[PDB]
Design an enzyme around this catalytic site. Structure first.
Site, PDB file in Angstrom:
ATOM      1  N   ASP A  52       2.184  -0.753  -4.918  1.00 51.80           N
ATOM      2  CA  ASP A  52       1.452   0.202  -5.387  1.00 51.80           C
ATOM      3  C   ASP A  52       2.409   1.448  -5.343  1.00 51.80           C
ATOM      4  O   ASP A  52       2.942   2.015  -4.450  1.00 51.80           O
ATOM      5  CB  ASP A  52       0.447   0.940  -4.194  1.00 51.80           C
ATOM      6  CG  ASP A  52      -0.233   2.475  -4.424  1.00 51.80           C
ATOM      7  OD1 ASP A  52      -0.030   2.652  -5.553  1.00 51.80           O
ATOM      8  OD2 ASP A  52      -0.700   2.933  -3.653  1.00 51.80           O
ATOM      9  N   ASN A  56      -3.838  10.785  -2.280  1.00 53.99           N
ATOM     10  CA  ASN A  56      -4.212   9.598  -2.181  1.00 53.99           C
ATOM     11  C   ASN A  56      -5.837   9.795  -2.661  1.00 53.99           C
ATOM     12  O   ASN A  56      -6.504  10.712  -2.512  1.00 53.99           O
ATOM     13  CB  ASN A  56      -4.769   9.435  -0.596  1.00 53.99           C
ATOM     14  CG  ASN A  56      -5.285   7.986  -0.139  1.00 53.99           C
ATOM     15  OD1 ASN A  56      -6.340   7.568  -0.482  1.00 53.99           O
ATOM     16  ND2 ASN A  56      -4.426   6.914   0.226  1.00 53.99           N
ATOM     17  N   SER A  57      -6.514   8.624  -3.061  1.00 53.74           N
ATOM     18  CA  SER A  57      -7.577   8.710  -3.861  1.00 53.74           C
ATOM     19  C   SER A  57      -9.001   8.603  -3.066  1.00 53.74           C
ATOM     20  O   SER A  57     -10.022   8.848  -3.273  1.00 53.74           O
ATOM     21  CB  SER A  57      -7.877   7.209  -4.535  1.00 53.74           C
ATOM     22  OG  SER A  57      -6.640   7.028  -5.499  1.00 53.74           O
ATOM     23  N   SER A  99       0.829  -1.286  -0.065  1.00 56.78           N
ATOM     24  CA  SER A  99      -0.054   0.037   0.157  1.00 56.78           C
ATOM     25  C   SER A  99       0.912   1.318  -0.017  1.00 56.78           C
ATOM     26  O   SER A  99       1.674   1.421   0.907  1.00 56.78           O
ATOM     27  CB  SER A  99      -1.028  -0.063   1.116  1.00 56.78           C
ATOM     28  OG  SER A  99      -1.541   1.329   1.685  1.00 56.78           O
ATOM     29  N   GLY A 100       0.594   2.028  -1.062  1.00 56.62           N
ATOM     30  CA  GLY A 100       1.361   3.307  -0.981  1.00 56.62           C
ATOM     31  C   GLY A 100       1.025   4.005   0.282  1.00 56.62           C
ATOM     32  O   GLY A 100       1.890   4.547   0.914  1.00 56.62           O
ATOM     33  N   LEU A 101      -0.208   4.309   0.725  1.00 52.64           N
ATOM     34  CA  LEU A 101      -0.607   4.630   1.718  1.00 52.64           C
ATOM     35  C   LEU A 101      -0.171   4.411   3.148  1.00 52.64           C
ATOM     36  O   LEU A 101       0.495   5.275   4.138  1.00 52.64           O
ATOM     37  CB  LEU A 101      -2.029   5.004   1.909  1.00 52.64           C
ATOM     38  CG  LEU A 101      -2.906   5.404   3.380  1.00 52.64           C
ATOM     39  CD1 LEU A 101      -2.384   6.747   3.744  1.00 52.64           C
ATOM     40  CD2 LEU A 101      -4.220   5.229   3.227  1.00 52.64           C
ATOM     41  N   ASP A 114       2.296   4.363  -7.091  1.00 57.97           N
ATOM     42  CA  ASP A 114       1.878   5.551  -7.360  1.00 57.97           C
ATOM     43  C   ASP A 114       1.509   5.800  -8.909  1.00 57.97           C
ATOM     44  O   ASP A 114       1.041   5.091  -9.623  1.00 57.97           O
ATOM     45  CB  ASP A 114       2.444   6.740  -6.633  1.00 57.97           C
ATOM     46  CG  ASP A 114       2.159   6.737  -5.101  1.00 57.97           C
ATOM     47  OD1 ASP A 114       1.125   6.392  -4.880  1.00 57.97           O
ATOM     48  OD2 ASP A 114       3.304   7.047  -4.433  1.00 57.97           O
ATOM     49  N   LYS A 168       1.129  12.667  -6.521  1.00 58.58           N
ATOM     50  CA  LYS A 168      -0.271  12.252  -6.300  1.00 58.58           C
ATOM     51  C   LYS A 168      -1.010  12.542  -5.148  1.00 58.58           C
ATOM     52  O   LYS A 168      -0.224  12.662  -4.159  1.00 58.58           O
ATOM     53  CB  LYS A 168      -0.339  10.630  -6.943  1.00 58.58           C
ATOM     54  CG  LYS A 168       0.661   9.748  -6.269  1.00 58.58           C
ATOM     55  CD  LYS A 168       0.591   9.667  -4.715  1.00 58.58           C
ATOM     56  CE  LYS A 168      -0.850   9.074  -4.335  1.00 58.58           C
ATOM     57  NZ  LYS A 168      -0.957   7.524  -4.725  1.00 58.58           N
ATOM     58  N   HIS A 226     -10.574   1.647  -9.941  1.00 60.98           N
ATOM     59  CA  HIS A 226     -10.746   2.164  -8.619  1.00 60.98           C
ATOM     60  C   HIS A 226     -12.114   3.209  -8.458  1.00 60.98           C
ATOM     61  O   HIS A 226     -12.654   3.485  -9.624  1.00 60.98           O
ATOM     62  CB  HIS A 226      -9.461   2.878  -7.976  1.00 60.98           C
ATOM     63  CG  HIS A 226      -9.517   2.886  -6.621  1.00 60.98           C
ATOM     64  ND1 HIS A 226     -10.420   2.303  -5.873  1.00 60.98           N
ATOM     65  CD2 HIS A 226      -8.721   3.376  -5.742  1.00 60.98           C
ATOM     66  CE1 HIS A 226     -10.192   2.401  -4.521  1.00 60.98           C
ATOM     67  NE2 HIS A 226      -9.014   3.231  -4.480  1.00 60.98           N
ATOM     68  N   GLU A 271      -0.554   4.307 -11.563  1.00 60.58           N
ATOM     69  CA  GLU A 271      -1.852   4.931 -11.857  1.00 60.58           C
ATOM     70  C   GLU A 271      -1.781   6.258 -12.514  1.00 60.58           C
ATOM     71  O   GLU A 271      -0.786   7.096 -12.766  1.00 60.58           O
ATOM     72  CB  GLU A 271      -2.370   5.563 -10.308  1.00 60.58           C
ATOM     73  CG  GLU A 271      -1.152   6.503  -9.770  1.00 60.58           C
ATOM     74  CD  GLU A 271      -2.004   6.614  -8.313  1.00 60.58           C
ATOM     75  OE1 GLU A 271      -2.645   5.999  -7.755  1.00 60.58           O
ATOM     76  OE2 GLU A 271      -1.391   7.888  -7.727  1.00 60.58           O
ATOM     77  N   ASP A 273       0.667  10.312   2.073  1.00 58.58           N
ATOM     78  CA  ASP A 273       0.565   9.526   0.962  1.00 58.58           C
ATOM     79  C   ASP A 273       0.715  10.351  -0.438  1.00 58.58           C
ATOM     80  O   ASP A 273      -0.379  10.582  -1.288  1.00 58.58           O
ATOM     81  CB  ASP A 273      -0.206   8.553   0.644  1.00 58.58           C
ATOM     82  CG  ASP A 273      -0.625   7.830  -0.355  1.00 58.58           C
ATOM     83  OD1 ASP A 273       0.425   7.441  -1.127  1.00 58.58           O
ATOM     84  OD2 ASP A 273      -1.714   7.557  -0.868  1.00 58.58           O
ATOM     85  N   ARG A 292      -3.695   1.559 -13.144  1.00 59.19           N
ATOM     86  CA  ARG A 292      -4.814   1.867 -12.520  1.00 59.19           C
ATOM     87  C   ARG A 292      -5.481   2.968 -12.986  1.00 59.19           C
ATOM     88  O   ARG A 292      -4.799   4.334 -13.362  1.00 59.19           O
ATOM     89  CB  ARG A 292      -4.351   2.097 -11.048  1.00 59.19           C
ATOM     90  CG  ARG A 292      -5.184   2.910 -10.027  1.00 59.19           C
ATOM     91  CD  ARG A 292      -4.550   2.494  -8.523  1.00 59.19           C
ATOM     92  NE  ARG A 292      -5.285   3.354  -7.703  1.00 59.19           N
ATOM     93  CZ  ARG A 292      -4.483   3.407  -6.426  1.00 59.19           C
ATOM     94  NH1 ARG A 292      -3.394   2.508  -6.277  1.00 59.19           N
ATOM     95  NH2 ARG A 292      -5.203   4.279  -5.456  1.00 59.19           N
TER      96      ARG A 292
HETATM   97  O1  LIG Z   1      -3.409   1.660  -0.521  1.00 58.66           O
HETATM   98  C1  LIG Z   1      -3.115   2.689  -1.186  1.00 58.66           C
HETATM   99  O2  LIG Z   1      -2.195   3.487  -1.149  1.00 58.66           O
HETATM  100  C2  LIG Z   1      -4.207   2.827  -2.251  1.00 58.66           C
HETATM  101  O3  LIG Z   1      -3.445   2.666  -3.475  1.00 58.66           O
HETATM  102  C3  LIG Z   1      -5.393   2.789  -2.436  1.00 58.66           C
HETATM  103  S1  LIG Z   1      -6.023   4.313  -1.848  1.00 58.66           S
HETATM  104  O4  LIG Z   1      -5.752   4.207  -0.420  1.00 58.66           O
HETATM  105  O5  LIG Z   1      -5.559   5.395  -2.679  1.00 58.66           O
HETATM  106  O6  LIG Z   1      -7.488   4.253  -2.019  1.00 58.66           O
HETATM  107 MG   LIG Z   2      -1.994   4.305  -3.151  1.00 57.23          MG
END
Ligand SMILES: O=C(O)C(=O)CS(=O)(=O)O
Ligand SMILES: [Mg+2]
Ligand SMILES: O=C(O)C(=O)CS(=O)(=O)O
Ligand SMILES: O=C(O)C(=O)CS(=O)(=O)O
Ligand SMILES: O=C(O)C(=O)CS(=O)(=O)O
Ligand SMILES: [Mg+2]
Ligand SMILES: [Mg+2]
Ligand SMILES: [Mg+2]
Lengths: 291, 291, 289, 289
Positions: free
Chosen positions: B81, B118-119, B42-44, B83, B116, B186, B110, B54, B155
């Site tokens: 992930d 966070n989504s 997970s990027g986050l 990014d 970036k 997503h 993505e 993130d 993504r």
């Molecule tokens: O876990 C992450 O960093 C993700 O890619 C999904 S989100 O947290 O960006 O929705």
């Molecule tokens: Mg992410």
């Protein structure tokens, strides 16, 4: 009020102090938010989160990098369990400079050999550093400091190594005289016998630090009775984190659904808040062309 | 059976697959021990454990370093992930090489801009990469691989960015044709509407990956009904870890004792076992002069 | 072919092979283009470019990253001078794995204690490791590698320390039987006497590597006649770099101008070529709309 | 005095100051000893020693570590050439903090997009950042520093990109009003025309920094007459190092011997002195029983 000063004052305070283990930036922020005046950079918890052993497998700059993220994310002092100094006095003093620069309040060194073995292990070689030598290392670290308030804590693994009181006491005196800012007396006994013994024989020559992990049942007020300056909650955030992840991972595995964890774990918005995402938003609105 | 191959097979399997988030070596080992066939870097969660946001604050080599410790401590594939690729196709392909070398199975990129956001955030700029361009980046990553089985997941943040189905579908097709090994669709909607919509319009042009974080209530079997190849449990180990540490830290703070946590958290011996301390002991007995 | 294979082949050739010292990505690419079949990852030079001492001050991972940029920039092998291994056997084997993954071809470990002290020094104390311990450390590395061709070169410091032929042979035999792919017999003497005495007694048990730094007048053919499998020019590119930087810096400092250096230094286009900027141009053409 | 103060003082002096390029700890110490009052942390040179391209391939932290070894090895300031900042304002301010803690004195940011492309290139596309955005990025850095003397130099690439004086002035004025401590007007032209045209219109609003690489025949005095506060010799030590490494490597490769290079390169003892090995000796005497 610099972090070094804070840690210096806690060690020097007659009043009993408490620092809590954190092993990463995230936990560093939490320990601070809970109100703790200090943070213990557990040698074991840091190596544990990385997935390696507490035996100098990660490089010292990797340990320092981890700790850098921790310093940036905390306003309270971090005392780093720096093992044996990662080498001789020279590796020791070089580490002390990197620590000051990153905002770390102090380093704790133990009179063992490089690479070291965790102290909580039974029946394993736990060889000691020549006293006179370790003292020069202590002194070389103290001499190397730029910031007067930076703290150098000497750890006597004498009891741990199976030796007696005379040995422990001898080492402690040697390192305190070498300039150390506090002596960390360790033991793995399930009772506070060793601490009770050292403290009795110490006659307040200097602030003493302890790690009550193995004798956790001991009444805290008893440490005040003996006159200990600081207690270290050495690894419980690391251990709790495992339970949570093992339980959570198991639950999600079994149900193939998030239904049974969503309400037991913190929210996504709580994470964003611990990263201080609101500060970036403020800044984004301020430094990004409006449209 | 190389990790890349494993991840390749999971993505390509008609059968629905599951990868679980891990954000460090320790959690990587746990996810594996629980039985999971894969790990989501997970990027986050990775930036979160560091204490930063993130939003590409940690450098990509710092992200890769974290992931290195994770790869070393796991036998199951890690999809990172990544990014937006940390820059253009060149930063992208350089990252892909570092990933292969560390044992990482694949990277997920993505169609957004660097750095970036966070989504999961509401009401924030979520600008998209020019389609044709992001596709070349996808292709440059695929072309750069040395290991045929390495995975590159594209993504589409179209739904996230507030656009519609035509857009999402357009992007997906573009990147799949560019060589991507799966498309990650997503959405942040509390319902699976967007996924239901894309999948209906996709006509199985390629394996699809989803992140059910915001619509967790959705019956998992429904993803199989739609024909999704893999679901990603994106951040629950990170979130659980916070609860545990916040609760544990609070409890220890309040009682100034370890009495109320000792039985709720994992043991010191469980940590030693997760670091595989027994393997070192074996090795120590084997490569250290007996006496 | 595989870098590790390239290097093992060199250590086992009946021919006197040569590997040149490099200390960063750039010099490693130069060495490569010059023709050299191998590169010596000089701890001294690597530490020296960082502005630090050859005393294990820079962490072992910082050295690894330096060598990573180096491996990335060359198709020939690099034998990393990993001092004593940066710790005990465990630290050594952790090193071997990483080095493998980074594409490095081998590691030469020396039998002194951590932190080490450069060999060319005089009067400085040079403590030797216990033979079995060090030998067991060599085995551990050999047992840990995952690429059978990655080479572990064991380096004997018995002479550097001040002991005799009898001591060097014993240590060299022990490390070789432990699984070393080659033995490096060092010597800071003015002539090849130490190497002579050893090569003679060695009886070609295994490949032997040497570093002629202090006895550079020995005609190279003599090493061939002694049976020496490989020679290491250990610090000349680093020493050359300094000479050039000291002078270019002096000239510019005095002239407050560049006219007297611009005709005595490679061109900016030469730097671009060394960075393989041409490859990026071909790539940007493919991957940029 | 404080490195940052040292450097701010130079940018504000009514005197034409000079800062020499360095690319690793070692060259930075050489520059220091040569007399230079400042060092230019050349992105091109730094990337070039790593064997990579001046294209933001090496992460911004890898550049930071390189400069950390560099700052550690010098008492004079180092102005890091931080390309466009490695991202948006947020990435820039994260950079400023780290650079501060590492002891670096300032950062020069350029108004192009991430990832950047070296300036001396011809035909390569050079996209300019939005003026307000870049200006807002400069403010952010100035607002984020915790050491008021740390200097943020804003660099205008308007000419390099192919636009005119009118465009350079507008960008330079904007960045200066945003809080830049100095403006760097670049130019790849054969003569100082671009700098002339700008210095003339600038009206000495703020300190102006230049890089004479392509118009090195301009007599230095002319810059004084234009009012130029600082000149950057940007890549000569790097270009010199290569020249010396290419030749020493060639000579050795051909002679299969060291005799023809050992008298054309600094000595091993010179390397030790550059590593301040003497300080370690004094220290070992104090801290080793
Ligand atoms: O876990 C992450 O960093 C993700 O890619 C999904 S989100 O947290 O960006 O929705
Ligand atoms: Mg992410
Ligand atoms: O937490 C650590 O790493 C300690 O210093 C204490 S012990 O775990 O070694 O007992
Ligand atoms: O370059 C080094 O560090 C060497 O191994 C050779 S010597 O300088 O130690 O002789
Ligand atoms: O050294 C660099 O990267 C420079 O800033 C100058 S130039 O090479 O871009 O002209
Ligand atoms: Mg410890
Ligand atoms: Mg060496
Ligand atoms: Mg530049």
């Amino acid at each position: 009020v610099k972090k070094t000063t804070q840690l210096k004052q806690m060690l020097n305070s007659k009043d009993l102090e408490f620092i809590m283990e954190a092993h990463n930036g995230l936990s560093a922020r939490i320990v601070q938010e809970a109100g703790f005046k200090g943070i213990w950079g557990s040698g074991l918890s840091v190596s544990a989160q990385l997935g390696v052993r507490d035996s100098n497998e990660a490089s010292w700059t990797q340990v320092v990098e981890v700790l850098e993220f921790m310093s940036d994310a905390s306003d309270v002092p971090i005392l780093l369990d720096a093992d044996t100094g990662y080498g001789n006095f020279n590796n020791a003093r070089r580490l002390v400079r990197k620590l000051e620069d990153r905002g770390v309040a102090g380093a704790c060194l133990e009179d063992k050999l490089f690479p070291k073995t965790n102290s909580l292990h039974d029946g394993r070689a736990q060889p000691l550093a020549d006293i006179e030598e370790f003292a020069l290392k202590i002194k070389a670290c103290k001499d190397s400091q730029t910031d007067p308030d930076f703290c150098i804590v000497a750890r006597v693994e004498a009891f741990i190594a199976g030796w007696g009181l005379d040995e422990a006491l001898k080492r402690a005196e040697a390192y305190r005289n070498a300039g150390a800012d506090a002596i960390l007396m360790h033991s793995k006994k399930a009772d506070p016998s060793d601490i009770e013994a050292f403290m009795k024989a110490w006659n307040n020559q200097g602030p003493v630090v302890i790690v009550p992990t193995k004798y956790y049942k001991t009444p805290t007020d008893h440490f005040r009775d003996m006159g200990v300056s600081m207690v270290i909650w050495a690894n419980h955030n690391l251990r709790a984190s495992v339970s949570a992840i093992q339980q959570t991972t198991k639950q999600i595995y079994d149900d193939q659904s998030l239904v049974n964890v969503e309400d037991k774990i913190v929210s996504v918005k709580e994470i964003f808040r611990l990263q201080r995402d609101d500060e970036l938003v403020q800044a984004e609105d301020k430094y990004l062309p409006k449209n």
